[PDB]
Amino acid sequence: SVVTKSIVNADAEARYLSPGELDRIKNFVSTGERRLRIAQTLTENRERIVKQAGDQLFQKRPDVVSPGGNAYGEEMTATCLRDLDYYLRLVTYGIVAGDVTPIEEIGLVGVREMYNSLGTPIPAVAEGIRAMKNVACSLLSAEDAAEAGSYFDFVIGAMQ
Amino acid sequence: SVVTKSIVNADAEARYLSPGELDRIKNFVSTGERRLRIAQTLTENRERIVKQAGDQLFQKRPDVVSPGGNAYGEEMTATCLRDLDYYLRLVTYGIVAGDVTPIEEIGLVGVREMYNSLGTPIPAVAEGIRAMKNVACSLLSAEDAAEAGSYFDFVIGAMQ
Amino acid sequence: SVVTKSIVNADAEARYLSPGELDRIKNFVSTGERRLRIAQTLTENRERIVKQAGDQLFQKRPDVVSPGGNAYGEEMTATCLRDLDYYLRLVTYGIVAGDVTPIEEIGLVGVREMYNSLGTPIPAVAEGIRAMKNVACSLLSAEDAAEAGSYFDFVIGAMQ
Amino acid sequence: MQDAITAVINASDVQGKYLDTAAMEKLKAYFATGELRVRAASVISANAANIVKEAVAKSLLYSDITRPGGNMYTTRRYAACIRDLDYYLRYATYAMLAGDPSILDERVLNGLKETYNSLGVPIAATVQAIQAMKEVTASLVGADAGKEMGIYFDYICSGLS
Amino acid sequence: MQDAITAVINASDVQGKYLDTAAMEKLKAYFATGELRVRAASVISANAANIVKEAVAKSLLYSDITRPGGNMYTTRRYAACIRDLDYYLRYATYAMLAGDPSILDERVLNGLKETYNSLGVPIAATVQAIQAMKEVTASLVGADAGKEMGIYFDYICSGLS
Amino acid sequence: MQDAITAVINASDVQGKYLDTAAMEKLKAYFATGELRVRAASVISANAANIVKEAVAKSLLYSDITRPGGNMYTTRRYAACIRDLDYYLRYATYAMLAGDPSILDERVLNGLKETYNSLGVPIAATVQAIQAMKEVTASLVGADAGKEMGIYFDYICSGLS
Numbered sequence: 030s031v032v033t034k035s036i037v038n039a040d041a042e043a044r045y046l047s048p049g050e051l052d053r054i055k056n057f058v059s060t061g062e063r064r065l066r067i068a069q070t071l072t073e074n075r076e077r078i079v080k081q082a083g084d085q086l087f088q089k090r091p092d093v094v095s096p097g098g099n100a101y102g103e104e105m106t107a108t109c110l111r112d113l114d115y116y117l118r119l120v121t122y123g124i125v126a127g128d129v130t131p132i133e134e135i136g137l138v139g140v141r142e143m144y145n146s147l148g149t150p151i152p153a154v155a156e157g158i159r160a161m162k163n164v165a166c167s168l169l170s171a172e173d174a175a176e177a178g179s180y181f182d183f184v185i186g187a188m189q
Numbered sequence: 190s191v192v193t194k195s196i197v198n199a200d201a202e203a204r205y206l207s208p209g210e211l212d213r214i215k216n217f218v219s220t221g222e223r224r225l226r227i228a229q230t231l232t233e234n235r236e237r238i239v240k241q242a243g244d245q246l247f248q249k250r251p252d253v254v255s256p257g258g259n260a261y262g263e264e265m266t267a268t269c270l271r272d273l274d275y276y277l278r279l280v281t282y283g284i285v286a287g288d289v290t291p292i293e294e295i296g297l298v299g300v301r302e303m304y305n306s307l308g309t310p311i312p313a314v315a316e317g318i319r320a321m322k323n324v325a326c327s328l329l330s331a332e333d334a335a336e337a338g339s340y341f342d343f344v345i346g347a348m349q
Numbered sequence: 350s351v352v353t354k355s356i357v358n359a360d361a362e363a364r365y366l367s368p369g370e371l372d373r374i375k376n377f378v379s380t381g382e383r384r385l386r387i388a389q390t391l392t393e394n395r396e397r398i399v400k401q402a403g404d405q406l407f408q409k410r411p412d413v414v415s416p417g418g419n420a421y422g423e424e425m426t427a428t429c430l431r432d433l434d435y436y437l438r439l440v441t442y443g444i445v446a447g448d449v450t451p452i453e454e455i456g457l458v459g460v461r462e463m464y465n466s467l468g469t470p471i472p473a474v475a476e477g478i479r480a481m482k483n484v485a486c487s488l489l490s491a492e493d494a495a496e497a498g499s500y501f502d503f504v505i506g507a508m509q
Numbered sequence: 510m511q512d513a514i515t516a517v518i519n520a521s522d523v524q525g526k527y528l529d530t531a532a533m534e535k536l537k538a539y540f541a542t543g544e545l546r547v548r549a550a551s552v553i554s555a556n557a558a559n560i561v562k563e564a565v566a567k568s569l570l571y572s573d574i575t576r577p578g579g580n581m582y583t584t585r586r587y588a589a590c591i592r593d594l595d596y597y598l599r600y601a602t603y604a605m606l607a608g609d610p611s612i613l614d615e616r617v618l619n620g621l622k623e624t625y626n627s628l629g630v631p632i633a634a635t636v637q638a639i640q641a642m643k644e645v646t647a648s649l650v651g652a653d654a655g656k657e658m659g660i661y662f663d664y665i666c667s668g669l670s
Numbered sequence: 671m672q673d674a675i676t677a678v679i680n681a682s683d684v685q686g687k688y689l690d691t692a693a694m695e696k697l698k699a700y701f702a703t704g705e706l707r708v709r710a711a712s713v714i715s716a717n718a719a720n721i722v723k724e725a726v727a728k729s730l731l732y733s734d735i736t737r738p739g740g741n742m743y744t745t746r747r748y749a750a751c752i753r754d755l756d757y758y759l760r761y762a763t764y765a766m767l768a769g770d771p772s773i774l775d776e777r778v779l780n781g782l783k784e785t786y787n788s789l790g791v792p793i794a795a796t797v798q799a800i801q802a803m804k805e806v807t808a809s810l811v812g813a814d815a816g817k818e819m820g821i822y823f824d825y826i827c828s829g830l831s
Numbered sequence: 832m833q834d835a836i837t838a839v840i841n842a843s844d845v846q847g848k849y850l851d852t853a854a855m856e857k858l859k860a861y862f863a864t865g866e867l868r869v870r871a872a873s874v875i876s877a878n879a880a881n882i883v884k885e886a887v888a889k890s891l892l893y894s895d896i897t898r899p900g901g902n903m904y905t906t907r908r909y910a911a912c913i914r915d916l917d918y919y920l921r922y923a924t925y926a927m928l929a930g931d932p933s934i935l936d937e938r939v940l941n942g943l944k945e946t947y948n949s950l951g952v953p954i955a956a957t958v959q960a961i962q963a964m965k966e967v968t969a970s971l972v973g974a975d976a977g978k979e980m981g982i983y984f985d986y987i988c989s990g991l992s
């Protein structure tokens with residue numbers, strides 16, 4: 030959260046939180062009820078949001094799901110989707126926190142090092158998360174979609 | 190002492206004391222008998238030197254000893270004098286040592302941090318030590334007074 | 350060896366040995382049979398090589414072996430020669446290794462600090478090792494002499 | 510560092526589950542208490558220095574552990590003990606804002622007991638000093654936040670024995 | 671650092687003796703095996719990254735110790751375990767070239783067990799991972815160098831228990 | 832660091848008392864012995880290097896602990912042992928000037944035993960080496976200062992067991 034990000038910064042200058050910081054954690058706790066609503070809605074449709082988003086990807090990148098590409102046979106493909114559900118879960122986290130750190134520490138610090146070892150295309154993964162951002166955003170209001178949108182863009186942008 | 194201050198400096202250059210340093214600890218041990226005489230005389234009159242010096246202060250700064258000032262009622266005032274006797278004792282120390290360090294380490298390293306917490310005026314304390322330097326100096330010879338004078342000035346100068 | 354000197358350099362850049370390094374340890378292991386031959390020959394004549402080389406020195410520097418010089422009486426002189434045999438042994442080491450480090454670590458890192466404490470002339474010692482390089486080199490082929498020559502020169506050069 | 514929220518998600522992430530039902534509430538509970546935390550924090554920031562003065566006077570001053578021999582005796586010692594108390598209030602207050610003792614165990618309680626037994630700093634007395642800050646603090650921020658400041662205050666204490 | 675040779679001389683220097691008779695052979699033995707070492711080294715340098723991929727797949731992937739809770743779960747953890755395996759192959763390979771375990775005990779095995787028991791890294795699994803590198807490596811460099819790579823590989827293992 | 836004087840005042844300051852009656856004498860005693868200390872110090876500064884040479888010859892040279900295997904064998908080892916002896920004389924001499932063992936326990940004896948048992952440095956021999964410096968030193972500075980140099984010399988010794 031920002032509560033956590035403020036304390037840290039403040040302890041670095043060895044001082045009590047500045048009024049401005051408090052003004053922030055104040056107006057951030059007031060945004061809570063909503064935040065949780067957004068996470069709750071994505072987590073009730075997590076099942077579908079991943080499936081079609083899963084198809085939308087395999088259509089744009091048939092090399093992923095045919096002979097010679099990473100996700101091949103129900104075997105490999107089944108896990109590819111798994112990877113995608115992993116990230117949806119991390120999105121609801123960032124959202125509830127009002128921060129992106131949870132995503133960073135849980136599934137961003139060395140995504141490339143990991144995937145390169147497995148020989149899976151990262152740009153392909155990036156399109157897999159993009160697709161999701163659209164399936165999920167379709168279930169949200171005009172605003173609950175803009176904000177929830179950030180957390181999806183931050184990921185894809187690191188996938189490069 | 191200078192014996193102690195020389196060794197330190199010497200160990201920093203990893204070498205035996207230079208002839209000049211030895212020339213110093215030599216002419217400093219020769220000043221000893223006297224030094225002790227000065228300390229001895231102040232320590233026999235410590236009782237009076239603090240009392241009148243105590244009055245001389247309360248006269249110049251009646252705000253110290255009236256309603257709303259730190260040293261108020263026999264209660265607070267009694268300790269104020271105590272503080273003053275503390276410093277006389279540290280003066281005899283510096284004198285015997287021929288150094289000022291004992292005063293620094295015992296009652297100078299953060300005097301302000303301490304007193305600010307107690308809300309006591311430091312400039313007022315400074316005048317309390319000044320007064321003493323005059324009561325005590327009156328009991329000493331022309332020279333035993335000049336030298337003994339230093340140790341009192343060094344304190345007051347830090348009281349600011 | 351160079352095997353050892355390569356690994357070190359390589360671990361410093363955190364990488365597998367470069368082809369060039371391997372090219373070296375490769376052409377160095379091929380020089381082995383010979384190297385050992387050279388060491389073997391010096392170690393069979395170590396006895397004589399030190400003796401005459403020992404005389405050759407005492408002739409050029411009679412101050413070493415007369416009244417007032419370090420190596421005096423069978424007592425001191427006996428050890429002087431000892432010192433010289435010490436270094437022959439370290440030469441065969443450097444040779445077998447194809448490196449000079451063994452000599453450095455075993456008898457070069459502070460030779461001066463040691464000898465100064467004993468009051469023995471280093472330039473005199475240097476001539477004692479020089480003489481050897483000639484006695485030993487006389488037992489070697491044109492080439493086995495050039496290479497074996499290095500290890501003797503490296504020492505003397507540090508003796509200054 | 511962790512706070513009440515980051516705390517909730519981490520525990521759900523270890524199991525792989527999406528935000529639970531009970532999890533969604535902890536986040537709510539926290540959110541509901543947010544203001545009063547920020548409110549209380551501002552107060553203890555305004556008095557921070559006095560909230561130490563009084564405590565010292567109530568427990569450490571005019572006693573054996575300030576006169577010659579008492580381990581705060583010394584113009585360097587005195588300043589060093591206030592310096593510590595100042596720490597304890599600045600960290601207690603963070604922990605309170607974060608709704609978790611995470612910073613305390615992270616940037617406070619680690620080996621503190623050691624250096625102390627080591628230098629001679631009197632454990633029992635420093636605890637009484639902070640225990641006194643609880644009272645003095647509970648008086649200006651309120652009972653609600655005071656009970657909240659209390660727990661973290663008592664946390665710093667139990668972390669010395 | 672020490673190698674088979676520097677190893678031989680040091681042991682003879684402690685006694686003061688010139689290169690012994692048995693000593694002259696160790697140096698020969700080493701010299702005779704030189705090439706095959708350099709040869710093998712080049713190979714495991716060309717595959718170094720795949721010689722890790724396969725091992726991971728054979729022992730660490732699709733198991734409890736990668737899913738949530740398994741101590742490599744986490745995009746930071748995964749990268750950290752490959753990072754280690756990469757180390758083990760780069761050092762095993764040196765030790766092999768040097769014909770002595772000297773670097774291993776020097777810049778590897780010192781306190782490794784500690785930090786591990788300390789962070790929670792699963793000893794048993796990391797050993798299985800490297801044990802798997804032996805197989806995968808023995809397949810491309812040959813049986814001769816593989817038995818040579820093996821011993822140093824098994825050295826890194828015994829140095830965790 | 833402390834010296835005979837700073838030592839006296841510190842002990843009186845812990846109790847809060849002004850310079851005692853017995854205290855005033857220690858300061859006198861010290862002052863009375865001042866010169867001879869400075870005098871002796873100058874002498875051991877002029878011979879400092881020879882006062883090590885002789886000691887070494889009397890106890891460490893031409894023995895098992897210099898030939899191959901003896902832990903000073905090695906052009907690096909030899910220089911390292913004189914280096915130490917040099918230390919012991921430079922610190923012994925300070926302690927003597929200060930009239931207190933304070934520097935010794937401060938910048939000398941702390942953990943020295945450890946590293947030693949640790950590296951293999953022979954305790955018993957290094958003590959004999961310094962014990963030999965006492966004799967050699969007592970011969971040029973005199974019996975008076977020698978007994979004074981002795982005590983601090985024996986202090987450095989007892990601080991290894």
Ligand SMILES: *[C@H](C)[C@H]1/C(=C/c2[nH]c(/C=C3N=C(/C=C4\NC(=O)C(CC)=C4C)C(C)=C\3CCC(=O)O)c(CCC(=O)O)c2C)NC(=O)[C@@H]1C
Nearest residue numbers: 093099100109112135136153154157731732736743744745
């Ligand atoms: C799907 C959109 C794409 C794809 C996926 C794919 N992934 C794997 C294997 C693994 N994926 C992970 C991922 C993570 N581990 C983490 O800790 C986190 C952060 C929470 C993530 C995202 C891991 C660890 C594996 C290893 C197997 C395991 O889980 O044990 C595969 C399998 C590769 C194989 O052949 O084995 C695939 C196919 N592949 C694609 O092509 C899509 C673009």
Ligand SMILES: *[C@H](C)[C@H]1/C(=C/c2[nH]c(/C=C3N=C(/C=C4\NC(=O)C(CC)=C4C)C(C)=C\3CCC(=O)O)c(CCC(=O)O)c2C)NC(=O)[C@@H]1C
Nearest residue numbers: 253259260269272295296313314317570571575582583584
């Ligand atoms: C008198 C000239 C002035 C004055 C003094 C005053 N002091 C206090 C309280 C304390 N003073 C000290 C001082 C020292 N502690 C040290 O270790 C040293 C170095 C050796 C010194 C000088 C301390 C520790 C206290 C705290 C009480 C205690 O001793 O436990 C007071 C009392 C304040 C109160 O209301 O409690 C006073 C009044 N005040 C003046 O106005 C004079 C200028």
Ligand SMILES: *[C@H](C)[C@H]1/C(=C/c2[nH]c(/C=C3N=C(/C=C4\NC(=O)C(CC)=C4C)C(C)=C\3CCC(=O)O)c(CCC(=O)O)c2C)NC(=O)[C@@H]1C
Nearest residue numbers: 413419420429432455456473474477892893897904905906
């Ligand atoms: C001979 C060419 C010259 C010479 C030699 C000489 N040396 C000594 C005494 C010692 N020499 C050593 C040498 C080494 N120690 C090592 O560890 C190494 C590296 C392997 C070397 C080379 C040592 C340790 C001693 C001390 C005695 C001992 O071994 O215990 C002496 C004796 C001096 C004395 O009076 O005691 C002499 C004479 N002197 C010369 O003049 C020649 C030029």
Ligand SMILES: *[C@H](C)[C@H]1/C(=C/c2[nH]c(/C=C3N=C(/C=C4\NC(=O)C(CC)=C4C)C(C)=C\3CCC(=O)O)c(CCC(=O)O)c2C)NC(=O)[C@@H]1C
Nearest residue numbers: 574580581586589590593596616617628630631634635638
């Ligand atoms: C006051 C209530 C009591 C007291 C305290 C006292 N403390 C010290 C020295 C240290 N205290 C700490 C503690 C912290 N440092 C930190 O940064 C933090 C926050 C992360 C804490 C809690 C440390 C590290 C030291 C030593 C290093 C330093 O000097 O800062 C002393 C001084 C001891 C000395 O002489 O060196 C004292 C006196 N003393 C009391 O009587 C009270 C009961």
Ligand SMILES: *[C@H](C)[C@H]1/C(=C/c2[nH]c(/C=C3N=C(/C=C4\NC(=O)C(CC)=C4C)C(C)=C\3CCC(=O)O)c(CCC(=O)O)c2C)NC(=O)[C@@H]1C
Nearest residue numbers: 735741742747750751754757777778789791792795796799
């Ligand atoms: C992989 C087979 C297993 C695994 C490993 C794992 N290791 C760490 C962390 C560290 N590993 C080391 C080891 C080394 N560092 C080196 O420089 C060298 C060569 C000299 C070695 C052998 C160290 C020092 C660390 C900690 C410091 C660092 O992060 O680099 C982790 C991370 C633990 C954490 O969360 O911080 C992991 C996961 N994990 C497995 O499941 C495999 C069985």
Ligand SMILES: *[C@H](C)[C@H]1/C(=C/c2[nH]c(/C=C3N=C(/C=C4\NC(=O)C(CC)=C4C)C(C)=C\3CCC(=O)O)c(CCC(=O)O)c2C)NC(=O)[C@@H]1C
Nearest residue numbers: 896902903908911912915918938939950952953956957960
């Ligand atoms: C000589 C009488 C004996 C002897 C000594 C020997 N010592 C070392 C190594 C070290 N000695 C010290 C000691 C000090 N360092 C200091 O700065 C001070 C003054 C504050 C002292 C007393 C230290 C720190 C070391 C290690 C670090 C260093 O190398 O300086 C060795 C070397 C061991 C090695 O191989 O690394 C030796 C041989 N040896 C003897 O045989 C005598 C009995």
